[PDB]
Amino acid sequence: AAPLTRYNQLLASNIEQLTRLQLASANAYAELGLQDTQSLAALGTVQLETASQLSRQMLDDIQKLSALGQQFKEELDVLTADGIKKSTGK
Amino acid sequence: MDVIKSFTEQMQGFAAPLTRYNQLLASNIEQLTRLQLASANAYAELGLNQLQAVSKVQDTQSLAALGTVQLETASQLSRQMLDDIQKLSALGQQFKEELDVLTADGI
Amino acid sequence: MDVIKSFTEQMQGFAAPLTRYNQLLASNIEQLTRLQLASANAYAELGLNQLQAVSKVQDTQSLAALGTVQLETASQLSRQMLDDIQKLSALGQQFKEELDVLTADGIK
Amino acid sequence: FTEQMQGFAAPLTRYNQLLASNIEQLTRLQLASANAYAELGLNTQSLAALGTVQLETASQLSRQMLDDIQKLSALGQQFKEELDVLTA
């Protein structure tokens, strides 16, 4: 469990969102591919601005993830220090 | 005749910025995938080497060797976890950057 | 005005099949991603449980936890790997399938 | 017995690699298509041909994907035969 899972989840999460973005883009090209240069400049602007927002959120989730990861490394350092004490055992 | 038309479309400059955008997306998808593959391979190598390790401790009695395996696997786990988070943060930064260049040049 | 135009495009049927192809690809990328995440979480869980088990040791009589978690971890990892291969084969099989209906319908 | 653990590492990576293989390639497909349309945006039999060629590309990637899944599953199944023998 723990931030390990949380991190793989954020990873896959971002992959998915980006794919849906590339799909939105591809569809938007095929349409119109079928007063229009106003809509072209608009399209480039809009897909830039959507990707931009997604990058904002990805970086926020990265920051929070780093926090939960702080909790976990606190938990792991106790496990490695128990390992050290036992390792001096025999 | 392919070359002239590709040059002139390259000169008009209409498909180039959009292709830049798609290209950028595909790249970040690729880099995220490779991060997930590396994480997965790391967790696998941990569980496997801990399994062989606990087996070689099975065929002895020293609780010290057991503790040394515990120490190694926990320490390397923290290692891998923090380095993975950092890799990801870098990926997110460089993506924000490339996007700001593309919006900037768009104007 | 959005509705009439999308109705007439869906009726012409020129942009629809290409969009179907793009949707096919996007869906398989999604499913492959989720399959990989599941695999990753599996290796993570099995590793971490065996770590907590090895941390619960001390007292040499604890070789029972050693053999039981080791046997459990090994056989369950067999399962995981084989079932993962099956999910992936299924995904590739079904991908083939939808491609063949799209080629078939594209011909006609 | 611990010897057998070597035989986990081959398919596991081979599995994980394969997954990511298929993801990359699919994304390139999604990319090529996504800018193929884009070229036609700057500009009707070219459309039919474009669809045919996308469907064919993806089909070939599919054959390859299914052959690699065959080889992998053979590795895993041989390895399971040996493991089910070793627990006996």
Residue numbers in the entry:
A (entry chain C): 17 to 50, 60 to 115
B (entry chain A): 3 to 109
C (entry chain D): 3 to 110
D (entry chain B): 9 to 51, 62 to 106
The authors write:
PHAs are stored intracellularly as granules surrounded by a layer of phospholipids and several types of granule-associated proteins including PHA synthases, PHA depolymerases and a group of proteins known as phasins or PhaPs. PhaPs are proteins that bind to the surface of PHA granules, and can be regarded as an interphase between the cytoplasm and the hydrophobic PHA granules which functions in preventing granular coalescence. In this study, the crystal structure of PhaPAh has been revealed, and a mechanism proposed for its binding to hydrophobic PHA materials. Generally speaking, PhaPAh forms tetramers with 8 α-helixes in aqueous solution and two different types of peptide chains were observed in these tetramers, whereby a hydrophobic and a hydrophilic surface is present in each monomer.
PhaPAh native crystals diffracted to 3.0 Å, as observed using the Shanghai Synchrotron Research Facility (SSRF) BL17U beamline. After rounds of phase improvement and extension, model building, and refinement, the final structure was refined to a resolution of 3.00 Å with Rwork of 22.70% and Rfree of 29.50%. Size-exclusion chromatography and dynamic light scattering (DLS) analyses indicated that PhaPAh exists as a tetramer in solution and the final model in the asymmetric unit consists of four PhaPAh tetramers accordingly. The overall shape of the tetramer somewhat resembles a flat rectangular brick, with two short N-terminal helices from chains A and D protruding outwards from two opposite sides of the “brick”. The four monomers in the PhaPAh tetramer adopt two distinct conformations: type I, observed in chains A and D and type II, observed in chains B and C. When chains A and C are superimposed based on helix 2, a major conformational difference is found between types I and II, in which the position of the entire helix 3 shifts downwards in chain C. A very significant phenomenon, observed in both conformations, was the focused distribution of hydrophilic and hydrophobic residues on two opposite sides of the PhaPAh monomer. The formation of the tetramer can accordingly be rationalized the following way: chains A and D expose their respective hydrophobic surfaces to each other, while loop regions of these two chains are next to each other forming a shape resembling chopsticks. The still exposed hydrophobic regions of the stacked A–D dimer then recruit chains B and C through hydrophobic interactions to form the tetramer. The recruitment of chains B and C leaves no hydrophobic region exposed to the solvent environment in the tetramer.
